[PDB]
Paper text:
The structures show that the Cus1 fragment binds to the α-helical surface of Hsh49p RRM1, opposite the four-stranded β-sheet, leaving the canonical RNA-binding surface available to bind RNA.
The Hsh49p–Cus1(290–368)p construct yielded small needle-like trigonal crystals, which diffracted to a maximum resolution of 2.7 Å, but at this point we were unable to solve the structure by molecular replacement or isomorphous replacement, partly due to twinning. It was previously shown that RRM1 of Hsh49p binds to Cus1p, so we coexpressed RRM1 of Hsh49p with the same Cus1p peptide (290–368). All four molecules in the asymmetric unit are very similar with average overall RMSDs for the main chain of 0.22 Å for RRM1 and 0.42 Å for Cus1(290–368)p. The higher resolution crystal structure of RRM1–Cus1(290–368)p was used for the detailed analysis of the structure of Cus1(290–368)p and the interface between RRM1 and Cus1(290–368)p. The Cus1(290–368) domain is folded with most secondary structure elements located at its periphery, and it covers almost the entire α-helical side of RRM1. At the center of this interaction surface, a completely conserved tryptophan (Trp312), located at the bottom of α2 of Cus1(290–368)p, lies flat in a hydrophobic cleft on the surface of RRM1 created by α1, α2, and the extended linker between α2 and β4. The interface between RRM1 and Cus1(290–368)p is stabilized by face-to-face hydrophobic stacking interactions. The Hsh49p RRM1–Cus1(290-368)p structure fits well into cryo-EM density of the Bact spliceosome, corroborating the biological relevance of our crystal structure.
Author numbering:
A (entry chain A): 8 to 86
B (entry chain E): 289 to 350
The structure:
Amino acid sequence: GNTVYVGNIDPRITKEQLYELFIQINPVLRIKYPKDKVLQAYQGYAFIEFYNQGDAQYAIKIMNNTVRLYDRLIKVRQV
Amino acid sequence: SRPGRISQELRAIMNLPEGQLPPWCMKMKDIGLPTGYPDLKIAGLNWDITNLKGDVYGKIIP
């Protein structure tokens, strides 16, 4: 319940950029940002862990379809 | 990194010039301020809009 799924992420985006963005919305505990280790390429999605379920739910409501990174509209969903 | 400021690097990526409220502004007016930052003040919401200056749009003010 404390983790959200973030999608439509341009592979140029860094974990530190995702952190700067999402700490605007609530405190962030950790980010899991899957990478193909053979190609060292991000895969278009991430998991952002907030400190509790309320804070995650708030983030989904505020951020889904709200921000474009490299012109791509970011999706935020419960997972 | 901190709530209420956005770096030049992230601003370029977001297409958010200095002096403009971030795009979640309207939704925060509807839903409320961050559940996890009780003392966050955002320019144009619960902080004077004249504080929307440079890379700053909000500040934690206890």
